[PDB]
Amino acid sequence: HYQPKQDLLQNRIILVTGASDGIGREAALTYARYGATVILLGRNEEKLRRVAQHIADEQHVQPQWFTLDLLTCTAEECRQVADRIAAHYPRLDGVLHNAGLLGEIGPMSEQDPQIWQDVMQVNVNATFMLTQALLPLLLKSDAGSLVFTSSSVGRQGRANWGAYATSKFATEGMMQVLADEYQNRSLRVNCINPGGTRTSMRASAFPTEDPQKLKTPADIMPLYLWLMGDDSRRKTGMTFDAQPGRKPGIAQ
Amino acid sequence: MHYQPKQDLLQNRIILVTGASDGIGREAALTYARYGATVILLGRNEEKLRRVAQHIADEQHVQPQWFTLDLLTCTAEECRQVADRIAAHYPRLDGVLHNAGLLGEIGPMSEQDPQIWQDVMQVNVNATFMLTQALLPLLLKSDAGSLVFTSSSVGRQGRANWGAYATSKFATEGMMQVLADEYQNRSLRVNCINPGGTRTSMRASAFPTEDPQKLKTPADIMPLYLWLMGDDSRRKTGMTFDAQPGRKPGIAQ
Numbered sequence: 334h335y336q337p338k339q340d341l342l343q344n345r346i347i348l349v350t351g352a353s354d355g356i357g358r359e360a361a362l363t364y365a366r367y368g369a370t371v372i373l374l375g376r377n378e379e380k381l382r383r384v385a386q387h388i389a390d391e392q393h394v395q396p397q398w399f400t401l402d403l404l405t406c407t408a409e410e411c412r413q414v415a416d417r418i419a420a421h422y423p424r425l426d427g428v429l430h431n432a433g434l435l436g437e438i439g440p441m442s443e444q445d446p447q448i449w450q451d452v453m454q455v456n457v458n459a460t461f462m463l464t465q466a467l468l469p470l471l472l473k474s475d476a477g478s479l480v481f482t483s484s485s486v487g488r489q490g491r492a493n494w495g496a497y498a499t500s501k502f503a504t505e506g507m508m509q510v511l512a513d514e515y516q517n518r519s520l521r522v523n524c525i526n527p528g529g530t531r532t533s534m535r536a537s538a539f540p541t542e543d544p545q546k547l548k549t550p551a552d553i554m555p556l557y558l559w560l561m562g563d564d565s566r567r568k569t570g571m572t573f574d575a576q577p578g579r580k581p582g583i584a585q
Numbered sequence: 586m587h588y589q590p591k592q593d594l595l596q597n598r599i600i601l602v603t604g605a606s607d608g609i610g611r612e613a614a615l616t617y618a619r620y621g622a623t624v625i626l627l628g629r630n631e632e633k634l635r636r637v638a639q640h641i642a643d644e645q646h647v648q649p650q651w652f653t654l655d656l657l658t659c660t661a662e663e664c665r666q667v668a669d670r671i672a673a674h675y676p677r678l679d680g681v682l683h684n685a686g687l688l689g690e691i692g693p694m695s696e697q698d699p700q701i702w703q704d705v706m707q708v709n710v711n712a713t714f715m716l717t718q719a720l721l722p723l724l725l726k727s728d729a730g731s732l733v734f735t736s737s738s739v740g741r742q743g744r745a746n747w748g749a750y751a752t753s754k755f756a757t758e759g760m761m762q763v764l765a766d767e768y769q770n771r772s773l774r775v776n777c778i779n780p781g782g783t784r785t786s787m788r789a790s791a792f793p794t795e796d797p798q799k800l801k802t803p804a805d806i807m808p809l810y811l812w813l814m815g816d817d818s819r820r821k822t823g824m825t826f827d828a829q830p831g832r833k834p835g836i837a838q
């Protein structure tokens with residue numbers, strides 16, 4: 334139902350994490366198609382260069398990319414990325430925290446403790462540290478938009494989703510704290526729950542699922558566009574479902 | 586909450602309490618012993634733990650055992666070693682109260698110390714998970730085990746300046762729900778308790794201008810703690826309960 338003009342994001346500088354594949358890749362491509370100056374973040378250089386070349390072929394402007402491994406980045410290793418961005422851009426109008434680690438799908442009694450900690454580190458701790466590093470740039474926007482990525486399991490825990498579900502609950506908590514802090518300020522903060530979407534992470538979570546029964550990243554982009562454009566400027570502290578009527582769990 | 590069980594409610598129940606050296610955990614340990622339980626005290630401060638054990642020994646004439654485990658510094662191995670020590674002395678665990686928690690510092694996200702943030706997540710989420718995992722076999726030996734996590738009002742709705750702590754309490758609720766779902770067809774029930782504003786040092790740290798005399802004490806909120814460990818709550822799982830349902834979240838006015 335949301336069909337914005339093709340220049341919705343013209344002149345908006347938007348950073349996308351996990352831009353090298355799946356939903357983040359589609360978000361980067363789509364934001365560029367809608368006029369934005371996109372900044373790509375990921376850990377795999379070759380995958381990032383590929384997405385950037387795809388965007389340059391269509392927009393005739395090469396977007397910049399930065400590699401940052403959220404699992405191993407120390408507190409200072411995130412601020413360094415913000416300094417590099419600040420050297421080339423005067424502000425950030427949007428930040429989409431899309432990067433995420435699934436970890437292990439299995440019972441709590443078997444959850445590998447190191448993997449548990451890695452999931453919490455990428456999805457929660459490093460996501461927080463990166464956010465802290467980028468807030469100054471976000472506050473230079475006339476109406477900045479900060480978006481975190483949750484999941485169906487971020488609102489209702491489900492058996493065998495261990496660290497990932499716990500990390501998505503944490504994500505919603507973090508978003509709500511930030512939304513309240515910036516309530517009457519220039520920055521809005523919200524979460525997007527994409528719902529079951531056709532990506533390799535989803536296929537790993539549900540190996541018996543038929544991915545053709547799922548919506549594609551392209552299909553769920555309207556919400557992604559809406560949160561970065563001016564139509565959502567009065568909305569903060571909310572978790573929005575990209576697929577409100579989708580039955581949670583494996584596709585039937 | 587007018588729950589007033591018989592004084593023998595927890596007779597022949599082995600219950601482990603973390604953060605048993607002060608505040609709510611200390612009160613829970615004393616109260617469970619008074620209601621008949623064989624209490625196991627966990628904390629990081631040996632001297633504090635010994636004092637609480639002695640206090641229970643003075644009244645029950647049966648001194649409960651204590652184990653030291655620092656949740657901020659423990660490894661998965663150290664949790665298994667404690668569960669192994671417990672299994673050596675006890676045949677099961679009928680209850681586990683995860684009461685231990687770290688507040689961190691009240692302040693905006695832009696100012697949050699990343700090391701303190703990590704410390705809060707480590708104690709409240711990661712170490713709480715590791716200990717849970719280590720204790721599941723003992724809990725499953727109970728006829729009706731009860732696993733209880735401790736949340737907060739900010740674990741249901743995030744508010745400004747609560748940073749790592751609010752985030753960790755959301756995580757706590759999530760972890761509890763995963764566990765409840767996994768054990769719903771087994772003998773173990775899993776729930777959360779939100780004690781509400783209670784007169785403790787952590788509460789004073791969270792609200793430095795609050796008059797603590799306007800708060801209920803840990804003793805005053807015990808009915809829910811007893812209820813969750815006794816047979817009257819055996820068909821309840823996956824829920825988050827408020828010890829003070831008639832209190833508006835926030836500073837005491």
Ligand SMILES: NC(=O)c1ccc[n+]([C@@H]2O[C@H](COP(=O)([O-])OP(=O)(O)OC[C@H]3O[C@@H](n4cnc5c(N)ncnc54)[C@H](OP(=O)(O)O)[C@@H]3O)[C@@H](O)[C@H]2O)c1
Nearest residue numbers: 351353354355356402403404432433484529530532534535
């Ligand atoms: N697809 C779904 O059904 C679904 C449902 C609900 C929520 N989500 C959420 O949607 C987001 C995107 O996931 P997706 O399905 O698109 O999965 P995906 O294709 O695996 O993409 C995940 C992205 O996160 C990046 N990433 C993982 N670990 C990283 C690290 N340590 N440092 C930096 N980047 C890292 C990945 O980089 P690499 O390319 O190097 O792997 C990748 O770009 C996640 O937050 C996920 O939890 C997805």
Ligand SMILES: NC(=O)c1ccc[n+]([C@@H]2O[C@H](COP(=O)([O-])OP(=O)(O)OC[C@H]3O[C@@H](n4cnc5c(N)ncnc54)[C@H](OP(=O)(O)O)[C@@H]3O)[C@@H](O)[C@H]2O)c1
Nearest residue numbers: 604606607608609655656657684685686782783785787788
């Ligand atoms: N008081 C409230 O108004 C309130 C409200 C909502 C939720 N809660 C929750 O209630 C629980 C109890 O809090 P409280 O108010 O009783 O706080 P408290 O008086 O500070 O007690 C905290 C307990 O946790 C233990 N602890 C802290 N860090 C530890 C560590 N690294 N390793 C092992 N144990 C550690 C403490 O040990 P030490 O004795 O060595 O310091 C202490 O026994 C917490 O989970 C808290 O989040 C409290």
Ligand SMILES: [Cl-]
Nearest residue numbers: 670671673674
């Ligand atoms: Cl021993």
